[PDB]
Amino acid sequence: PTPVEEAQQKTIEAITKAINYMAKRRIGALLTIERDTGMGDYIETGIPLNAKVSSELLINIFIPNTPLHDGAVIMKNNEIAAAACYLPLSESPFISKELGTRHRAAVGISEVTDSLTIIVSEETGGVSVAKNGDLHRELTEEALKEMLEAEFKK
Amino acid sequence: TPVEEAQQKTIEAITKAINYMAKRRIGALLTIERDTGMGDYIETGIPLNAKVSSELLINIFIPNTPLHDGAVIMKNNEIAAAACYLPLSESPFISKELGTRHRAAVGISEVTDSLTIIVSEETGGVSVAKNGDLHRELTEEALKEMLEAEFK
Ligand SMILES: CC(=O)Nc1nc(C)c(-c2csc(N)n2)s1
Ligand SMILES: CC(=O)Nc1nc(C)c(-c2csc(N)n2)s1
Ligand SMILES: [Cl-]
Numbered sequence: 001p002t003p004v005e006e007a008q009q010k011t012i013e014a015i016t017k018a019i020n021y022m023a024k025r026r027i028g029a030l031l032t033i034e035r036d037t038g039m040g041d042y043i044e045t046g047i048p049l050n051a052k053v054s055s056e057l058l059i060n061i062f063i064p065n066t067p068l069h070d071g072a073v074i075m076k077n078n079e080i081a082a083a084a085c086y087l088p089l090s091e092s093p094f095i096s097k098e099l100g101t102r103h104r105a106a107v108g109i110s111e112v113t114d115s116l117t118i119i120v121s122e123e124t125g126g127v128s129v130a131k132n133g134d135l136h137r138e139l140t141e142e143a144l145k146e147m148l149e150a151e152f153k154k
Numbered sequence: 155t156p157v158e159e160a161q162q163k164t165i166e167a168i169t170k171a172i173n174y175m176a177k178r179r180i181g182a183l184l185t186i187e188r189d190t191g192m193g194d195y196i197e198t199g200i201p202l203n204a205k206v207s208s209e210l211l212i213n214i215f216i217p218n219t220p221l222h223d224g225a226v227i228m229k230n231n232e233i234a235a236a237a238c239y240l241p242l243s244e245s246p247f248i249s250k251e252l253g254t255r256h257r258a259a260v261g262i263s264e265v266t267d268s269l270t271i272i273v274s275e276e277t278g279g280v281s282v283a284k285n286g287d288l289h290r291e292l293t294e295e296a297l298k299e300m301l302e303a304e305f306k
């Protein structure tokens with residue numbers, strides 16, 4: 001385990017801990033992780049943080065009725081770049097009618113970037129992921145961690 | 155100058171966040187490093203190294219959240235860490251009207267030249283600890299003058 005590999009693993013654990021905490025509490029969340037496609041244009045629409053990753057900061061951002069909780073958090077490598085960001089809303093006809101704006105935004109950014117977006121439903125606490133225009137819903141924590149590990153490789 | 159404009163933006167962010175928390179009576183503890191290094195206390199909290207904004211400061215201190223207990227420590231115009239430990243003053247002149255937040259603020263002000271702002275969770279009153287003294291029930295004008303004196 002090189003320092004970079006360990007850093008990546010700590011970031012993955014930080015994400016999965018935060019998502020699990022919010023899922024249990026029905027705390028709605030929208031977390032977009034930059035991959036190879038730069039997302040500066042969307043990062044600039046939010047509140048700049050440029051912060052180190054922690055599960056604690058991720059949770060604190062999404063607490064309901066707070067300044068930062070609406071909109072997307074966008075992450076870069078080992079960084080929380082900005083919160084309350086705008087994302088394009090998908091027009092896909094495959095987006096279930098019972099889903100929220102968070103899901104429409106996550107699929108939207110996944111259609112025009114190679115990013116990975118995680119969504120926590122404030123209705124059910126269910127966890128979903130948007131990638132390449134596809135939305136995969138009702139993920140177990142095992143499924144989420146394995147997705148992140150597969151996606152962080154490259 | 156760019157530095158000066160950055161400083162005033164930081165002061166405005168702090169004062170807007172403190173005003174918000176005072177109105178809601180949200181307890182808060184914010185220490186700003188000056189010439190005495192505070193790395194030993196920064197290391198006790200959660201690393202952030204985050205840009206200052208009123209929004210982030212508010213989100214940190216929301217009650218019953220991971221980051222709300224402990225001190226935020228600011229250094230070099232950034233939020234270095236949250237949920238940090240500070241030394242509790244042993245002064246016999248701190249009123250028992252005041253909380254652990256205030257005793258920690260006075261304590262760090264006894265061993266550093268930092269400026270610490272405290273919002274009371276009971277009254278929303280704003281105080282500042284500097285050089286071992288605690289200045290209570292501050293107006294918005296007095297807090298801004300203190301921060302301007304401190305950043306100059
Ligand atoms: C064109 C447009 O409207 N883009 C949006 N993006 C995001 C991330 C939004 C949002 C609103 S409330 C919430 N939790 N997330 S709206
Ligand atoms: C020895 C010791 O414990 N020092 C402390 N520092 C800080 C900043 C504290 C705090 C603020 S709010 C809360 N519940 N605790 S206790
Ligand atoms: Cl970019």
Ligand SMILES: [Cl-]
Nearest residue numbers: 028100121122
């Ligand atoms: Cl939702």
Ligand SMILES: [Cl-]
Nearest residue numbers: 126127137138
């Ligand atoms: Cl779901």
Ligand SMILES: [Cl-]
Nearest residue numbers: 180181217275
């Ligand atoms: Cl409170």
Ligand SMILES: [Cl-]
Nearest residue numbers: 218219220221
């Ligand atoms: Cl908590």
Ligand SMILES: [Cl-]
Nearest residue numbers: 253255274275
């Ligand atoms: Cl208090």
